[PDB]
Amino acid sequence: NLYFQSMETLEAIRTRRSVRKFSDRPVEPEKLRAVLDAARLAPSWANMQCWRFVVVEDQATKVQISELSYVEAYFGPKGYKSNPAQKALAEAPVVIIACGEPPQSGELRGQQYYLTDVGIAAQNLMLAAHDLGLGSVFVGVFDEQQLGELLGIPAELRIVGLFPLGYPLEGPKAGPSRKPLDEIVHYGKYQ
Amino acid sequence: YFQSMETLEAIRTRRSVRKFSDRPVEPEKLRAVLDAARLAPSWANMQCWRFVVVEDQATKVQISELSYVEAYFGPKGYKSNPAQKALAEAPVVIIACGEPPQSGELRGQQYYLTDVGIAAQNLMLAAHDLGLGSVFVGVFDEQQLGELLGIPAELRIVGLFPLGYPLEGPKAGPSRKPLDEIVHYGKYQA
Numbered sequence: 001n002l003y004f005q006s007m008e009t010l011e012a013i014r015t016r017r018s019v020r021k022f023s024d025r026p027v028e029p030e031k032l033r034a035v036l037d038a039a040r041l042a043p044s045w046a047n048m049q050c051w052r053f054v055v056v057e058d059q060a061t062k063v064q065i066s067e068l069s070y071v072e073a074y075f076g077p078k079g080y081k082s083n084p085a086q087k088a089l090a091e092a093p094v095v096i097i098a099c100g101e102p103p104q105s106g107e108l109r110g111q112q113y114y115l116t117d118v119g120i121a122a123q124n125l126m127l128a129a130h131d132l133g134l135g136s137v138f139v140g141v142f143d144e145q146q147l148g149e150l151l152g153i154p155a156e157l158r159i160v161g162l163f164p165l166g167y168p169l170e171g172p173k174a175g176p177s178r179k180p181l182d183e184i185v186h187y188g189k190y191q
Numbered sequence: 192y193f194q195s196m197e198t199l200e201a202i203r204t205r206r207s208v209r210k211f212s213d214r215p216v217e218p219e220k221l222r223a224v225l226d227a228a229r230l231a232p233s234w235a236n237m238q239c240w241r242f243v244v245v246e247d248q249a250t251k252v253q254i255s256e257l258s259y260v261e262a263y264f265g266p267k268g269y270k271s272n273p274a275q276k277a278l279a280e281a282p283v284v285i286i287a288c289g290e291p292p293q294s295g296e297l298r299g300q301q302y303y304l305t306d307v308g309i310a311a312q313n314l315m316l317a318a319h320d321l322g323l324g325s326v327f328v329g330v331f332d333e334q335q336l337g338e339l340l341g342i343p344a345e346l347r348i349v350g351l352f353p354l355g356y357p358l359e360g361p362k363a364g365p366s367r368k369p370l371d372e373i374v375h376y377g378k379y380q381a
């Protein structure tokens with residue numbers, strides 16, 4: 001169809017969900033290019049565009065990636081005792097590996113803005129995917145050392161997120177909650 | 192009231208806006224911009240971001256004055272801060288903060304920065320969609336800004352966002368690298 005699932009911007013922002021169950025239906029090359037181009041058009045620190053995307057479609061490689069995305073029992077990061085998106089990395093027809101080059105973005109106040117820049121691009125990627133009737137999910141749980149070795153990624157590049165990309169197998173699950181605007185927004189100075 | 196846009200078109204045409212009129216921002220539009228940010232995905236849905244909304248003129252002027260680039264050892268890519276005046280000019284400044292321990296801290300990476308980036312992009316896309324302009328400002332004296340606004344030191348300030356109606360018609364943005372420069376297909380050989 002290419003255009004049937006098109007949405008108004010605010011509607012796409014509202015209805016976008018993390019998708020973790022994918023059909024094996026292939027992703028049209030046109031849609032993949034559009035999703036990646038959306039990432040390309042993100043703003044970045046001084047327009048340095050420090051993001052780099054490795055796009056994997058090979059089945060054997062995707063299984064190997066999925067096997068590097070388990071949580072180490074009891075040594076998991078905050079909030080993931082397991083990785084609900086682990087199977088998605090094998091099952092989705094495409095996996096986009098989003099990387100950043102740290103010295104190619106702001107490094108001040110002990111903050112490394114390549115992480116911010118990749119976040120911005122990732123959100124363009126995920127909104128564009130959703131706009132085109134695809135699903136995706138940001139995967140932050142992965143063994144970076146082993147994944148870098150598997151993929152042969154240049155040493156200077158830091159891996160930030162993995163993105164399964166494909167057609168959702170099922171309809172929109174009523175996702176997790178959000179905090180009320182009153183909890184996350186404060187008006188004026190604070191005393 | 193806004194000229195609605197298809198998602199991909201908003202993504203493509205959103206620009207950093209640094210020149211603003213004094214036209215008031217409808218409270219409904221401000222709410223919608225903040226709601227867009229609220230709806231962003233985050234590490235384990237932790238929603239570590241916090242936003243401070245400043246409208247007071249004197250306070251915005253003071254924020255602007257803390258957003259200079261230092262003479263030497265200034266941040267990479269900014270020999271000056273083209274958005275500095277926008278902070279005083281815009282009707283609204285949104286200060287985006289995050290809590291480092293409320294997001295991923297692993298591999299020496301602090302995902303609060305990623306989470307705030309994701310939310311900021313929702314904010315900027317929604318603003319543009321609604322006929323407003325914004326720009327992500329990363330240059331600021333954090334200690335002084337936190338003191339000015341009463342942000343507890345345990346919250347880190349990540350970005351400042353002037354928000355208002357663009358003074359001028361849409362401008363051409365700077366370049367982007369061609370897609371082949373930022374995308375590689377398949378694993379690497381050797």
Ligand SMILES: Cc1cc2nc3c(=O)[nH]c(=O)nc-3n(C[C@H](O)[C@H](O)[C@H](O)COP(=O)(O)O)c2cc1C
Nearest residue numbers: 043044045046047206207273274327328329330364
């Ligand atoms: C993390 C981050 C920090 C930024 N900091 C500043 C800043 O301090 N001053 C400024 O004028 N622009 C800033 N920008 C805006 C970029 O310069 C702008 O996004 C880039 O040149 C691309 O232009 P566009 O947004 O019009 O596409 C920042 C953007 C990002 C993503």
Ligand SMILES: Cc1cc2nc3c(=O)[nH]c(=O)nc-3n(C[C@H](O)[C@H](O)[C@H](O)COP(=O)(O)O)c2cc1C
Nearest residue numbers: 017018084085138139140141175232233234235236
């Ligand atoms: C930086 C980041 C890392 C994430 N990592 C994972 C992950 O490793 N595994 C997973 O299943 N989901 C992951 N997610 C998805 C979040 O769990 C999800 O965005 C959140 O629960 C909100 O749900 P929604 O995206 O459907 O609105 C991640 C999201 C972000 C922003």
